[PDB]
Paper text:
Two crystal forms of glycosylated SGSH were grown at different pH values. Its structure was refined to 2.40 Å resolution. There are two molecules in the asymmetric unit of crystal form S and eight molecules in that of form L. The enzyme appears to exist as a homodimer in both crystal forms. Since the SGSH structure was determined in two crystal forms, S and L, we could use the ten crystallographically independent monomers of SGSH to assess the structural flexibility of the enzyme under two different crystallization conditions. The enzyme subunits display a low rigid-body structural flexibility in the S form (Cα r.m.s.d. of 0.20 Å between the two chains, with NCS restraints) as well as the L form (r.m.s.d. ranging from 0.10 to 0.17 Å, with NCS restraints). The relative orientation of the dimer subunits in the L form differs from that in the S form by 2.6–3.0°, indicating that the dimer interface is slightly flexible, possibly owing to crystal packing. However, the dimer interface is slightly flexible, displaying a rotation of up to 3.0° in the two crystal forms.
Mucopolysaccharidosis type IIIA (MPS IIIA) is caused by the functional defect of N-sulfoglucosamine sulfohydrolase (SGSH; also known as sulfamidase, sulfamate sulfohydrolase and heparan N-sulfatase; EC 3.10.1.1) and represents one of the most frequent lysosomal storage diseases worldwide. SGSH belongs to the sulfatase family and catalyses the cleavage of N-linked sulfate groups from the GAGs heparan sulfate and heparin. Despite the low sequence identity between this unique N-sulfatase and the group of O-sulfatases, they share a similar overall fold and active-site architecture, including a catalytic formylglycine, a divalent metal-binding site and a sulfate-binding site.
Author numbering:
A (entry chain A): 22 to 505
B (entry chain B): 22 to 502
Amino acid sequence: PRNALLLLADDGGFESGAYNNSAIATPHLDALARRSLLFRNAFTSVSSSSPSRASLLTGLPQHQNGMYGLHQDVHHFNSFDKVRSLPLLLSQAGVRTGIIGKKHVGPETVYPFDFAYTEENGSVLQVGRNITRIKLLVRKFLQTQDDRPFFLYVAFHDPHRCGHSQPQYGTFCEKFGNGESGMGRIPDWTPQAYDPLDVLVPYFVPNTPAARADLAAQYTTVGRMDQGVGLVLQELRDAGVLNDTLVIFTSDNGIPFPSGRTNLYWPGTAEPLLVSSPEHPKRWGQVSEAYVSLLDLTPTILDWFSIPYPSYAIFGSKTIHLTGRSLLPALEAEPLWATVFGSQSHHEVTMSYPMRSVQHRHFRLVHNLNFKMPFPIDQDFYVSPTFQDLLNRTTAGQPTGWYKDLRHYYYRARWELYDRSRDPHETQNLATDPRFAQLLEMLRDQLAKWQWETHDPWVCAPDGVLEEKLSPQCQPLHNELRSH
Amino acid sequence: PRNALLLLADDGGFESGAYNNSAIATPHLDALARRSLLFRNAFTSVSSSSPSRASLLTGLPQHQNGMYGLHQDVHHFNSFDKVRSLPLLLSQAGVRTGIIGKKHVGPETVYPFDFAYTEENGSVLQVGRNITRIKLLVRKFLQTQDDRPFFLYVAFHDPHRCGHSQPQYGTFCEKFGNGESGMGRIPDWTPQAYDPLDVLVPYFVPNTPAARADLAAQYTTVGRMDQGVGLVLQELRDAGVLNDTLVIFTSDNGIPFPSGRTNLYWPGTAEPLLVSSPEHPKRWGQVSEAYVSLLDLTPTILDWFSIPYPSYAIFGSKTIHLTGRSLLPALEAEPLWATVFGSQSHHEVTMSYPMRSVQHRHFRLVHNLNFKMPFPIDQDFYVSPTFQDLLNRTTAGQPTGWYKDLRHYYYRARWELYDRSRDPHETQNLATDPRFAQLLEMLRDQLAKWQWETHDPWVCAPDGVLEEKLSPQCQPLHNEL
Ligand SMILES: *[C@@H]1O[C@H](CO)[C@@H](O[C@@H]2O[C@H](CO)[C@@H](O)[C@H](O)[C@H]2NC(C)=O)[C@H](O)[C@H]1NC(C)=O
Ligand SMILES: *[C@@H]1O[C@H](CO)[C@@H](O[C@@H]2O[C@H](CO)[C@@H](O)[C@H](O)[C@H]2NC(C)=O)[C@H](O)[C@H]1NC(C)=O
Ligand SMILES: *[C@@H]1O[C@H](CO)[C@@H](O[C@@H]2O[C@H](CO)[C@@H](O)[C@H](O)[C@H]2NC(C)=O)[C@H](O)[C@H]1NC(C)=O
Ligand SMILES: *[C@@H]1O[C@H](CO)[C@@H](O[C@@H]2O[C@H](CO)[C@@H](O)[C@H](O)[C@H]2NC(C)=O)[C@H](O)[C@H]1NC(C)=O
Ligand SMILES: *[C@@H]1O[C@H](CO)[C@@H](O[C@@H]2O[C@H](CO)[C@@H](O)[C@H](O)[C@H]2NC(C)=O)[C@H](O)[C@H]1NC(C)=O
Ligand SMILES: *[C@@H]1O[C@H](CO)[C@@H](O)[C@H](O)[C@H]1NC(C)=O
Ligand SMILES: *[C@@H]1O[C@H](CO)[C@@H](O)[C@H](O)[C@H]1NC(C)=O
Ligand SMILES: [Ca+2]
Ligand SMILES: [Ca+2]
Ligand SMILES: [Cl-]
């Protein structure tokens, strides 16, 4: 019987030897990468936890599945009842499903799991960061197997920040379980300290002491996550099912720094992705240049279990189809896929800054629907040392060491067009350059077509109103905003 | 045994003889007004259907109960599970609950009804506009009563527009059931035609042929709603329970015209309100000047049944308390209440234009949190003849006959302060006038206090971020605001 394992890092980036970061040690991820096809050009469709996890587990963009923003307490976003998620479809096909760690999506009927240990019935600290607890839960899952195939979803909470919720464990909870007084112990974890002067400062992160300290703490926590991956894989090896299991590792969104999480800039949507098939080792240890999306995961896993996507509608007769594709074929031969999309509406319920993006190879186009208002900052990131430092220096009128300034971070153009082959930092907007008018129109057309195809309620915003029963379906408001 | 009846109009305004409109005939509402206390200064806290209905049925502002916007299909907003609504509390106290018409709120567990005929299990056209069907459902409700008190919620869908959904019935569905071909027949309804030249054109509605036609159609439909009220009251009278029943009539938000629905301007939140207590007829046929809110209805009805609001929390240990008050005391003697609040976030999910308001007597202060972006227009109103006409004339550069222009309707000041005793049209913003700096700060303080008191997640927006463990709790973003 075929099995599947989805390892999901929380706010994880490219901090690994597998992705050529020699400043950090991630031997277990590196080991996995040698048995995997590594993707250099993978992206999430949305840079917000719940929406990203909902899209990943449905194959549908947030504006289609209904997770327009964060799921918990006051934010309270849920996917539509009639949505058919991966786990649901797997269960109906006779596959045993399990989740360990951060779920952060609902409702339960849409995202059901036979075996569940999450924040809903326990501590996300334990089942998300305590890799020993995680390892034992994986062991229990495998011991209680019953001849059915399985799908195991391990959603680490590492390397997510902790500064807002639990500061006593460090900015990235890098102190939790380290053995020191009040921290407790995680027997299977060997803490890895990092010097702030040795960490790699990403181009979009301010080069300041405060930021480097943040990164050092992050590195330590990523190491814990790395060791967690090692333990999990070892449990399958001990149960004798690893060689029958498709393993996938990735992250839900960009790292929690400026221009990262919550942005549709490269840093906010670019994600690590490893795919290891025991049946297709031809391209083990290789790197793929194909442009892929987390919207491809549901299709990939369905393909793995030979389960077809059913024909159904959420509203009316509007039949639902996936825009992603199975990545399995890439495990045999390199494809030429070059296009990926992005869609984000809310993060927190108070943060309404819808963005839509399309990327064709190195060209990225972002549409900021509420561009005239300032880009909103979430409550957790606001208190990060990195942002506090940036805010402090900006307010004092002193050099920030940042590749942008807050003014331009807050107030953006409606359309942002970048060529990352020339301008990887995405600082040279080409949208108003007449030499790129034809390319702009092409990308706009591709984006709009995808929006209609995926029933985006925001498809006419902000210059127009959606009127389905007439033509054109987007009717103009004449609100001093251009239309297309 | 005491009963209560809540009659709720959808997008209803002051089109009635009771409110001194001589151009329309509303004999049944006028009759009700003679047996009730009429409120000249009643307001909804939010000018959007689901949020308004959730707030009305909970006593909590939309930003607290969780209905941030519309409830249906793609908009998909629901109140928090732990919210304790009026109907829930009544049920737990042994009161039989019933709803007939448009519900437009959820989830069911939060808003449960023993007897329910709504859009969720039938046609909103029938149970919302077909007053004969409504009358028979009321009859059925009363015939199946036991020795329990009852609370009956009749949510008319009239006089809501129909232009977007069902244009064949007219702009306001004023043709539905009129007898003509394809319209069907409503035996208990006597259609009332109106000349577009005779209707009263509200100050905030463009004086154009297209708008007057809209109003004429509205008047006809309001008449149907009026006759529906008559039938309902008559059913209680036939069951011999009217004299044991507290009757309340009002509307969920302002009329569907410019500056009305979806706005926190006077036209968008001002609502008609009649309260008839068979035990306190002292002030029957009188007019009250007290400033009241639909947030007062839940407290009022709870008071009527002698049911206390329980002590509980939705999140954490932050206990929930109502900011509204029972209106019952006003039925005996005129009070001095002068303050009312407003809070609106979304309408449609794609319409994010949060507004917060406070009104002290004739002074109204509105805060537009997303002011730099244009005011969004909903899909239903966009295709209205009134707006289409306005848009058309504006685009052609011709006179609109409107007291505003679209540019200023779309792009508003962050703070709008109006004195309606001098400027009822609300066109002279005083917020930037130094003469009103002290008053401005006072109203801002009242507004903010209410926001914190009601756990508003938008309390720091847009210039700051909420950090509860820090001081001040609103931390600055320095985002040019
Ligand atoms: C890490 O760096 C190595 C060495 O520079 C990269 O391997 C090279 O990849 C490119 C092909 O696009 C060429 O420089 C050579 O064909 C490769 N050289 C070797 C020695 O393998 C590799 O691509 C990088 N790894 C990742 C994940 O980006
Ligand atoms: C991580 O989880 C492990 C196992 O779930 C915890 O170790 C257990 O701790 C309990 C009480 O704290 C002991 O009674 C058990 O004997 C331990 N079991 C094992 C297998 O070690 C550990 O406390 C957790 N670490 C932290 C920092 O919370
Ligand atoms: C692990 O899985 C692989 C793939 O299924 C097994 O290798 C296959 O073995 C079969 C015979 O049983 C051959 O016909 C195939 O050609 C093999 N495929 C590949 C890709 O090598 C392997 O035997 C399994 N067991 C171990 C210990 O690796
Ligand atoms: C309908 O119109 C009448 C007459 O204008 C209003 O009654 C007047 O109210 C004002 C202000 O309260 C008093 O100063 C006058 O003495 C009243 N005149 C009369 C003849 O009664 C009445 O308030 C209006 N009704 C409504 C509901 O607005
Ligand atoms: C209608 O209801 C009122 C009030 O419930 C009745 O009048 C009350 O009668 C009770 C006892 O019969 C007295 O204690 C109250 O003082 C009365 N209230 C008032 C305001 O008069 C009245 O009898 C009822 N009418 C009918 C026909 O039954
Ligand atoms: C920012 O400034 C505040 C107040 O001046 C200070 O207390 C804090 O330490 C500073 N934080 C950072 C990260 O620089
Ligand atoms: C607005 O203009 C369009 C196109 O000229 C026209 O067809 C339509 O009838 C106009 N709408 C109104 C309400 O006059
Ligand atoms: Ca995340
Ligand atoms: Ca309404
Ligand atoms: Cl909830």
